[PDB]
Design a protein around this ligand. Sequence first.
Ligand SMILES: CN1c2c(nc(N)[nH]c2=O)NC[C@@H]1CNc1ccc(C(=O)N[C@@H](CCC(=O)O)C(=O)O)cc1
Ligand SMILES: CN1c2c(nc(N)[nH]c2=O)NC[C@@H]1CNc1ccc(C(=O)N[C@@H](CCC(=O)O)C(=O)O)cc1
Ligand SMILES: O=c1[nH]c(=O)n([C@H]2C[C@H](O)[C@@H](COP(=O)(O)O)O2)cc1F
Ligand SMILES: O=c1[nH]c(=O)n([C@H]2C[C@H](O)[C@@H](COP(=O)(O)O)O2)cc1F
Lengths: 260, 263
Amino acid sequence: MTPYEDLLRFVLETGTPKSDRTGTGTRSLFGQQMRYDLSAGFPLLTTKKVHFKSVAYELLWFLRGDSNIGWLHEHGVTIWDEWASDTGELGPIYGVQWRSWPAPSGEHIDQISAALDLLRTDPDSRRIIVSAWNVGEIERMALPPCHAFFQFYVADGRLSCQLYQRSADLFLGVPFNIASYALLTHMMAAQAGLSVGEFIWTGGDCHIYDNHVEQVRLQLSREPRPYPKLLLADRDSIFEYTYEDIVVKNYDPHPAIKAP
Amino acid sequence: MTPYEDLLRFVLETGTPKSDRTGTGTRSLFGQQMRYDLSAGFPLLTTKKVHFKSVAYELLWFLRGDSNIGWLHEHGVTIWDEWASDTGELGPIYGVQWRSWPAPSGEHIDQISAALDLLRTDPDSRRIIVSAWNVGEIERMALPPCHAFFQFYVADGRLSCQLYQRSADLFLGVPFNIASYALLTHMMAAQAGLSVGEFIWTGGDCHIYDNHVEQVRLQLSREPRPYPKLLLADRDSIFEYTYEDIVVKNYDPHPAIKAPVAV
Ligand SMILES: CN1c2c(nc(N)[nH]c2=O)NC[C@@H]1CNc1ccc(C(=O)N[C@@H](CCC(=O)O)C(=O)O)cc1
Ligand SMILES: CN1c2c(nc(N)[nH]c2=O)NC[C@@H]1CNc1ccc(C(=O)N[C@@H](CCC(=O)O)C(=O)O)cc1
Ligand SMILES: O=c1[nH]c(=O)n([C@H]2C[C@H](O)[C@@H](COP(=O)(O)O)O2)cc1F
Ligand SMILES: O=c1[nH]c(=O)n([C@H]2C[C@H](O)[C@@H](COP(=O)(O)O)O2)cc1F
C-alpha cells in the first residue's frame, strides 16, 4: 500500500552515515527496490503534496528530446535552472539520449520509438530497453543520468516497467521519479494497446540528505490516503501528448513540505 | 540463505507461460532481486556443481577486452562457441564495452579502469558504473548484453556490487553470472584495498526454459550446503590476474546436472 514510505523509513533507521559531494550528511543504503501495482492506483504520493505539473512538463520535455530549459520556462518550470548554462544548455541529457543517441554510423537512435515498436510487434522481447547512460557523453552533461536505464515487460497484455536509478534523493527526488515513470508507463501502454502492470523502482545509492531528516520525520507520521487516478486523452502518437491531455483525478494529498 | 533456489522455486511455481526468441517455451517473472553477503561465503552454488574454471576464464576474457573466442579455447572453455562467426568473432560484446566503449569522438573509454580509480580516489561517488549496453553498437553484437550493467558502492571499507541483468536463463546462465560478478567484486575490492560487502542481483526477464524443468525439480529436491571461500593471490593490477591466482576452498556441491542450451 505504501512502498515508498516503507523504504523511506527503512533508510532513516538502517541507513549508514556518509558524505556526498556536495551537500551534507546523508543516511544511505545500496540496492533497494520498491514495487507498485499500477492498476491499483496512480502512485502520486498522498503523504505530501507533490508538484505534478512540474513532473508532467518535465517528461514531455524529455520526450521532445530537448536539451535546453527554454521550453521548460515557457511553462513556468524551473527545477532545472540550477545547472543550466547562461544559454540554458544542459548538454546531451535524458531527452537527448532517449530520442537521438548518437550512434557511430552518424545515425541518431530514437529509443522511445524503438521500444514502442517492439511492444507492438514483439511483446515478448527481452530487449525492450531505454538507456540514458551514454558513457561517451557523460562528461558533456551538466549532470550524469540519475534515473539511468529502464526496461519494459509484457504479461497477459499488461505493461510493466522497471527503472534503475543509480542515485536517489529519497525525499525530494524519488517522489518525482515515481510519478514520472508511472506516467510514461501509462503513455507507452496507451500507445501500444496494453494495460498497466507493475512499476518496479530499483535504486543504487538510496539516501536521505542531512537537512531532510526533519522534513522526513513529519511525512512518516502522516496517514496515507487512497491513490489518485490517471486519465489520458486519445493521441495518434506518444510525441503528440500535451499537458492538457493529462488528468489526475481524486488526488487528496496531505499538505506539502518544502526543503532545499 | 538460498536466494538463488528461492527465486528458482518462485518462478517455477508462479511464473507466467511465455513465448521467446529461442523457439522453446518459458515460465517468466519480471523484476526479481537476489542478495548475497559476500563475507559469509563465495556464492558458487552447491545444489549443483558449477564449473568454476569456465566462470573464471570467461571473466578474465571480458577483462582483456576480447571478443574472439580463441583465447577461451586456448583454455578449454567452449561456452560461447555457438554464437561466434566462423572466425570466432562475437562482435563488440561485454569486454569490448568494459575496456573500450567507443565515444562519439572515436576514443575508447576504459570503464573498468575508470571505476577502480573512483574507488581508490572517491569511494563515496554515486557514479561508479560500468555499462555494456551500448545502444550504438548492439546490432553489431552477436547477442545483446544479458548482464547489462553494474554499479559499485562503498561503505565502512566494504565494497558492494549491484548488477542489472535484463534477461535471465535461471537454470543455465544465472549460476554463472552470480559467481562471475562475485569474483569480479573480490577483484575490484582487492585492487581498491577494500573488503567485500554484498552482491545484489537484479533481473528484468527472469525465466525457466520449459526443457529445463525436470532439472530444476531435481535441483530443488536437494539439500543446500554451505558456500565455499574464495582465495585471491596478490597482483598489482586487476588486469594481471590469472586462473592460477583464483582458488576455491571447501566447495562440495551436489552432482552436476546437464542441460541443453537455447540458441
Ligand atoms: C531531479 N534532479 C535532482 C538534482 N539534485 C538533487 N539533490 N535531487 C534531485 O531529484 N539535480 C538535477 C535534478 C533537477 N530536478 C529537480 C526536481 C524537483 C525539485 C524540487 O525542489 N521539488 C519541490 C517542488 C518545487 C518545484 O516544483 O519548483 C518538491 O518538494 O517536490 C528540484 C530539482
Ligand atoms: C550465458 N549465455 C547464455 C546464452 N544463451 C542462453 N539460452 N543462456 C545463457 O545463460 N548465450 C551466451 C552465454 C554463454 N554462457 C553459457 C554459460 C553455461 C552453459 C552451460 O551449458 N552450463 C552447464 C555446463 C557447464 C560447463 O560444462 O560449461 C551447466 O549445467 O552449468 C552454456 C552457455
Ligand atoms: O531524477 C532525479 N532524482 C535523483 O534523486 N537525482 C539526485 C541523486 C543525487 O543526489 C543528485 C545527483 O548527484 P550525484 O551525480 O552525485 O548522484 O540528484 C537527480 C535526478 F535528476
Ligand atoms: O549473462 C549471461 N546469462 C544470461 O542468462 N543470458 C541468457 C538469458 C537469455 O535467455 C539468453 C539470451 O536471450 P535474449 O537475448 O533473447 O534475452 O541468454 C546470457 C548471458 F550471456
